[PDB]
Amino acid sequence: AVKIRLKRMGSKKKPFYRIVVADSRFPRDGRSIETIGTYNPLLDPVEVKIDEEATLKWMHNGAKPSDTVRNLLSREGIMEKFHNQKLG
Amino acid sequence: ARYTGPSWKVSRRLGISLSGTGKELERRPYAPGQHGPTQRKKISEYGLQQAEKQKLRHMYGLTERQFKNTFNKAGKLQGKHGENFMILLEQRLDNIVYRLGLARTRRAARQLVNHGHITVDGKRVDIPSYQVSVGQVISVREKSAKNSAIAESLEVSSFVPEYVTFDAETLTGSLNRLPERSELAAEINEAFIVEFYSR
Amino acid sequence: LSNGIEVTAYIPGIGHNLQEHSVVLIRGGRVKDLPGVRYHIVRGALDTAGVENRGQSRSKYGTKKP
């Protein structure tokens, strides 16, 4: 089951996450299908950059955001679009 | 102060009077050691190239390994490799404080920067090798402020270079623009420095 | 040697303490004067001890700071 999740990279006690699409089976920092965006939690206003087009393409093919990703996509505001394109 | 030895013989051995004049001349102007006064000898090509390196290294007072690193990234720019080397070294926080007149010698300036006595853009900086850009303001941030050593060195400051601006009421130094090779040292052969590292 | 090869080494320095049935460390280096000697015995690494009353170039010959 392919799902979108964070990927930890950076230095010791300085994490930086890169939103990727990959299977659950593959390692956390291993194979991935493609990359969507990044996520910096250290910045006090957390800044995130997303494709907003590859995500919606993937979520109509059987992709599920994880716990932290869903908060990111909701705050950015594309799960509304996933709502509207589903029923419309 | 990475090199804590006597800063008097190095001028005599090199033959150039570091920090203005007086270290070499007036006193014994010949080389230190037992065989200083007599027993002169010729210099080979290796000696002439090597002696040029020693002038820059001991003038700005920094270690060999940094000298090699800052030389490599100096040559990554566009222009003449030798001239870009002194321009890049001139950017160091030690030299700017020395140029402003807050310290008498580079050793005094390096300690002044080291013991958190200065600030750039209102943030304390303790790295002597910090590379100052153009337009940044450098101050003291009170604390020491009216310090006898800093105030004494302000009076004995001779002149101030045209690429640095400083007024002795707020002590707000700044780099007017990137300096020029002609107005730096003028007693070193940068062509010999670059040839030394290409062998 | 530990791998079962019989070689000829050389003891540097002034005076030693080597005897038959003694364990020593050898390292590379050929001596020109000797016909068949091709290795040097390092001093101060094992049963072989440092040279006595060495004031300078002490890292070689394995003599500690006096």
Next chain:
RNA sequence: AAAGAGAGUUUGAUCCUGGCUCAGGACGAACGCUGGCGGCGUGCCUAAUACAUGCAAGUCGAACGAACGGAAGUUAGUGGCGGACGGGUGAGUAACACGUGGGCAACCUGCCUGUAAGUUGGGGAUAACUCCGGGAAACCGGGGCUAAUACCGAAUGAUAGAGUGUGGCGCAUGCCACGCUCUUGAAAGAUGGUUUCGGCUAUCGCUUACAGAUGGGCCCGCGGUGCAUUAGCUAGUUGGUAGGGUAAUGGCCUACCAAGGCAACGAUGCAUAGCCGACCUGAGAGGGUGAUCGGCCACACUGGGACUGAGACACGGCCCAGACUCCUACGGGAGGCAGCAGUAGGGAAUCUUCCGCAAUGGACGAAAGUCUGACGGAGCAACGCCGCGUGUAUGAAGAAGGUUUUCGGAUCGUAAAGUACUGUUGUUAGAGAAGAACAAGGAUAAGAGUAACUGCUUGUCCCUUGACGGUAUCUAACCAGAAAGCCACGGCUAACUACGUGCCAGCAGCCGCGGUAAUACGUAGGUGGCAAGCGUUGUCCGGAUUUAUUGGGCGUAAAGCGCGCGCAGGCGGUCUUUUAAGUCUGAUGUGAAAGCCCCCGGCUUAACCGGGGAGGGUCAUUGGAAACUG
């Protein structure tokens, strides 16, 4: 744009040829002397040797029969999913294993997403439990009783099979769409709202079918190693006919038939080796390597086999055989660190039997939640890279004391000592971060679906969680006080004087120094290179144009076969027309991420870490040009 350094050594002296040696850079390094700190990384290269002791794979009571509780509320076994992922190693392997590019009209795919049909009716058991029996123990038999989303029939339902009709087609074998006849193939309930109880209904499920996504299977072109003092190799081998088997084509297997197939463009054999992105060096072309990080492969004490499953011939699963260790009451039993730590052994050589699921990602669950030696952190080691501390300024024709002196002086040395100043580091005491998003739970609002709810999807508020750790980081004060070694000084190669020894002790990379005035041995004074280091050894590239495509040669220095006839191969006079294999050029797809390089930004700077870009192919499809080779 980029763009290349030489020196010593054959001779009485010279010019060439020619080898040897040196100056540079890099290690997962080791050893010797020495040793303050912080940040970021790295740490069994040998025995794929043998392994004490702990922990690394479980979960679900919302699928089915118990103990505390006056019968409210929480905890074994059957059953489902997961154990095929995550983690380790480099033995084997010279081949579709890998890299790159294609084909599958010759294939499969649990969980995930969408859509369409339904989820109707029965039956017989068996664990657990309860007795009996056997054995030291592992554990094995017999009798009786019970349930389920466990198991087995039944009704209904195939684009599954057979026989056809039509069309539209493609690459030969053949494909796509629709229609007709006949025959087979399915299922499960659980938790709640409403009503009434009939019944309906929300959520999670269950069966069949089709799509997408994901992960795999098979085939093919090209590419990357030594030996010819290794010339033949092969017999299911090569092709065909019929059948078997597989998810799928195929000698994959079998019966018959024929004798073929490969090789000097290097078969076969021996030796060595996981492959790549990449790493080191180099002006470049190349040469050497494949540790750490990422992708693929093979292996799991040594051989062989299969079961269960969507997926295995399965690291912490099973059966047999072998070697080894252990327990036996002698009948028999139990094991596998190349998982995280750790032990012995080998070695010149490599770390803690630590703290947590707080963050990320996994398995189970509807959810809290449980599991996670993955992963976050901490510990040891100057192993490497980066940063800066061992004090600053002024101060004598110049303190004493070393060391030398043609004895007047010179040098250590502005360094002492003196005066003035600072606290990076230290010691003490006070303040104290980010990493946190959550999930769940509570109110709402809007939607799809409803006879109506419950419930589902999205939005906003309330509440909640830190191993690191009182860590990083500030400000308050006192202290120049606790913090400098290593190698060389004849030339190459920067840096020279005394004393001791007397071809002895000894030095050495090469030339070569030492035989009672040694700038070369040993010690001092002084100097020169670096600095928390510095030297030696081992390995690789360079210099080496010393395998010369870039970039050498064969009269006398090494080097033209003793000469001819000639198969294969290499090369080929002049012009015209055509073609488009070589050649040049445009477009599309791809050459992952990380790394080198370019441009910006964050850590007080750097190392380091982010964002964007570039480069990298004798690559595939397709369109052009016609001078040159064909």
